[PDB]
Amino acid sequence: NKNSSYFVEWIPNNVKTAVCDIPPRGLKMSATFIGNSTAIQELFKRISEQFTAMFRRKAFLHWYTGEGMDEMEFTEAESNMNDLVSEYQQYQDATADEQGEFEEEGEEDEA
Amino acid sequence: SPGTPGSRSRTPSLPTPPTREPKKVAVVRTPPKSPSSAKSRLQTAPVPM
Numbered sequence: 722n723k724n725s726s727y728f729v730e731w732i733p734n735n736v737k738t739a740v741c742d743i744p745p746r747g748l749k750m751s752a753t754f755i756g757n758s759t760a761i762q763e764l765f766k767r768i769s770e771q772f773t774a775m776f777r778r779k780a781f782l783h784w785y786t787g788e789g790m791d792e793m794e795f796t797e798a799e800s801n802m803n804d805l806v807s808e809y810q811q812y813q814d815a816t817a818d819e820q821g822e823f824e825e826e827g828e829e830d831e832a
Numbered sequence: 833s834p835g836t837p838g839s840r841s842r843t844p845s846l847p848t849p850p851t852r853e854p855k856k857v858a859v860v861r862t863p864p865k866s867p868s869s870a871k872s873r874l875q876t877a878p879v880p881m
Binding site: 766769799803804806807808810811819820821822 | 881
């Protein structure tokens with residue numbers, strides 16, 4: 722409720738509860754957290770523009786070519802990653818509002 | 833005796849042609865460019881109403 726600007730608005734009730742009865746050893750009570758948020762894209766954004774600094778230079782690349790890895794494996798791994806970061810944008814600010822669709826058929830007597 | 837002997841090369845000189853400069857330095861043209869493409873992209877809805 723009080724952090725509701727920080728939850729995905731189309732997954733109403735985002736939580737999983739699990740509770741063991743046995744504490745950790747020498748504390749009275751404790752909890753361990755596991756959170757899936759779009760905010761983690763700063764990791765993937767950083768790694769992918771950093772990569773650009775190395776690879777638009779082809780810096781260090783010989784140490785992968787020295788083990789028979791090629792630029793096309795680079796190119797495919799970068800293109801997975803930009804695709805991964807784009808889908809974060811797709812789930813960031815994602816609208817909880819409904820869609821609709823509409824289309825027309827035939828032709829006018831002038832174009 | 834003559835102190836510069838005949839035992840020594842006396843090859844007489846030739847009509848050598850005129851001297852060209854060492855370097856041309858002809859003018860350059862700038863290379864072409866188009867603008868950089870965005871790599872991370874906008875996407876559509878995978879799911880409809």
